[PDB]
Amino acid sequence: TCPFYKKIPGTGFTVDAFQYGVVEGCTAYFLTHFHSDHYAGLSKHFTFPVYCSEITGNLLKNKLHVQEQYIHPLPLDTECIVNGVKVVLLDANHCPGAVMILFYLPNGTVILHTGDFRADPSMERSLLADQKVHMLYLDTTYCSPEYTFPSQQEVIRFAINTAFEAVTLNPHALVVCGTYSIGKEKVFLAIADVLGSKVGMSQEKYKTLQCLNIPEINSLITTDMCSSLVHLLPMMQINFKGLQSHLKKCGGKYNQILAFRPTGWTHSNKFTRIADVIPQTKGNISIYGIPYSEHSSYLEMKRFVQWLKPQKIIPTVNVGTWKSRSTMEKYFREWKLEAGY
């Protein structure tokens, strides 16, 4: 049955709650973003109203084949009414079309659901600043002080300079970027832009990108692999074996590969700076691991919560074990004692 952390009290709404069949009492199902864990259970067979961003709607329509009559896309940064209740969608700074949702309940309580997010100081001057938020449903993916990472911009600058140098040294080198869902698109778009190339990819992946309201997209991506010097492949293929094999398939148009595996955190964030990063190499193929995160670091999450000053926090990630919940409660108390709410 549908957990309490996916229900919004005093409404018949739920959030990211598609895997439990019909939820008794639920008149509207919100979807924060198009990642499979969150959409799990949605298909052409779903027949209740789904509320979401425009981008998330395009993906539902085109990739999942949800019937149009059930898709209710809402604009960002706009006060809207849904079944008698005032809501607002905000940019979550996660993957394309991902939202936070603000619910203004009839009793005067205000609730923020972050979905998945990467907290940023620009969220401190949104519509959130205009009133007290009483309850917060929080993306707690990285809620522990060991989780540090560079900014998105530091990582992109590194990727840019690396790719430019390698291809000016060897103009018959190919650049590859691994991917498994939407998100982290700036990695490959910024590499392509500095090399004066379009990004080549499979038909399924091109169909996905075409839904994302990216401006001038037709000038940036193609399905013609041969015409392009940056290619996208599944993350699973980003290894020496998979990369040699792909290199054979391109018809001796390239004699070297430089590949990037964007990841979350792994243990080497705890010593290394982005500037110290060196690849793994076997022969004419080099692989770089780059920590491009679309979740809040511990410090970004803590700052956001200390600013917001919620009366109650409801975690949405790592809630499956008592040890994690207990650990998270401990950090919420510290934050509250330091900041005085």
Q: Establish if 35 lies at the interface with Ni ion (CB under 5 A).
A: yes
Of 116 and 300, which CB lies nearer to Ni ion in the complex structure? 116
> Rounded to the nearest whole angstrom, what is the least distance from the CB of residue 116 to Ni ion in the complex?
4
Q: Which is nearer to Ni ion, 32 or 58 (CB)?
A: 32
Q: Which two tokens stand for residue 132?
A: 């007290």
| Secondary structure of residue 302 in the 3-state scheme | helix
Q: Which of 57, 62, 127 is nearest to 91 (CA)?
A: 127
The answer to the question of residue 184 lying near Ni ion (CB under 5 A) is: no
Q: CA–CA separation, 156 vs 153, rounded Å?
A: 5
Measured from the CB atom, is 35 or 231 closer to Ni ion? 35
Question: Least distance to Ni ion from the beta carbon of 33, Å?
Answer: 6
β-strand partners of 287: 259, 280
With contacts defined by CB under 5 A, name the span among 20-28, 34-42, 163-171, 262-270 that binds Ni ion. Answer: 34-42
Contact range with Ni ion by CB under 5 A, out of 17-25, 30-38, 117-125, 323-331: 30-38
C-alpha span between 328 and 282 (Å, rounded): 42
Of the two residues 35 and 205, which places its CB atom closer to Ni ion in the complex? 35
Q: Which helix (H) or strand (E) holds 339?
A: helix 322-339
Give the footprint of Ni ion on residues 125-164 (CB under 5 A).
none
Stretch that binds Ni ion, among 9-17, 68-76, 115-123, 333-341 (CB under 5 A): 115-123
Window contacting Ni ion (CB under 5 A); options: 35-43, 81-89, 188-196, 235-243: 35-43
Please tell me whether residue 340 adopts helix, strand or coil conformation. coil
* Cβ-Cβ contacts under 8 Å for 281 (sequence gap 6 or more): 287
Q: Name 313's bridge partners.
A: 136
* Residue 185 lies near Ni ion (rule: CB under 5 A): no
With CB under 5 A as the contact rule, the residue among 16, 116, 139, 300 that binds Ni ion is 116
Interface region with Ni ion, contact rule CB under 5 A, candidates 50-58, 109-117, 134-142, 152-160: 109-117
String of contacts with Ni ion for each residue 260-299, x by CB under 5 A:
----------------------------------------
In whole angstroms, what is the distance from residue 83 CA to residue 102 CA? Answer: 15
Strands 135-138 and 110-113: parallel
66 token code pair: 């949800």
Contact 183, 94 (CB under 8 A): yes
Footprint of Ni ion on this chain (CB under 5 A)? 35, 116
